[PDB]
Design a binder for this molecule. Sequence first.
Ligand SMILES: OC[C@H]1O[C@@H](O[C@H]2[C@H](O)[C@@H](O)[C@H](O)O[C@@H]2CO)[C@H](O)[C@@H](O)[C@H]1O
Ligand SMILES: OC[C@H]1O[C@@H](O[C@H]2[C@H](O)[C@@H](O)[C@H](O)O[C@@H]2CO)[C@H](O)[C@@H](O)[C@H]1O
Lengths: 129, 129
Amino acid sequence: ELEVKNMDMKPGSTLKITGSIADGTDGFVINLGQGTDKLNLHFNPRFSESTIVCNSLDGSNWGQEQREDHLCFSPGSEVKFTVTFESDKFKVKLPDGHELTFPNRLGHSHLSYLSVRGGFNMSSFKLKE
Amino acid sequence: ELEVKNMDMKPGSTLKITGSIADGTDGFVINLGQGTDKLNLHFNPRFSESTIVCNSLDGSNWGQEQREDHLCFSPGSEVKFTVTFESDKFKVKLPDGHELTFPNRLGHSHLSYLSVRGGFNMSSFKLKE
Ligand SMILES: OC[C@H]1O[C@@H](O[C@H]2[C@H](O)[C@@H](O)[C@H](O)O[C@@H]2CO)[C@H](O)[C@@H](O)[C@H]1O
Ligand SMILES: OC[C@H]1O[C@@H](O[C@H]2[C@H](O)[C@@H](O)[C@H](O)O[C@@H]2CO)[C@H](O)[C@@H](O)[C@H]1O
């Protein structure tokens, strides 16, 4: 339920998130955007469905749902995701090395809100230039 | 206006902040507390007065002000602060190992709100128990 607010994530920067995935959890959520009603990227690993459902949020309506069946990490372990923001798109680097890519459909050249929902408890985040 | 809402900082754990002091600023603030109304530790380095002002704020009530002139850093530099929360006091470890201490006046055994004002651009946040 943690929520970082008013950060300055410009294009080219890299956000490094390390946290722990609660035992026996269905999944979790990492939201990046301008605010709660505007999520440029909604990274959501569903252990239940065995997928990483990524999607965007523009107020009330979600965008087309994209899915990646490359859930190669487990609960009980503390892992790290490295998502690098780029005007054109985001590249999330999964803990097992596999890079993902989600489009910046909302045209936002600046992120400022992050929120950790679900069974993930992040111990630290690092914003690189 | 940067604010980390919803953290789970209990006594014993340690927050480890890192950032850049904006060139030309007169100071910056790091608030640790229950919210905007309740601040258990208001950490404020004044380059304009060359001290570090520490105080507590119970909604409207600002406690007795503490001033520590061990302000051995300047703007344009990257500093590191380590805040250990003992339920009885806050111990702030300055960039140069010098340790400060501020009594937990509001008697809380949990901190869930961080906020940064002033000319400090935060790059790291690590919280571990
Ligand atoms: O799209 C991300 C969004 O999905 C919601 O659930 C979807 C579900 O993934 C989809 O298969 C179904 O058709 O619609 C549901 C929404 O009504 C989640 O509830 C939400 O948290 C996001 O993860
Ligand atoms: O106690 C922290 C608190 O300080 C206020 O500033 C004081 C200042 O310390 C004092 O020298 C001056 O005489 O009065 C000011 C206002 O009462 C800040 O206004 C407040 O934001 C905190 O930083």
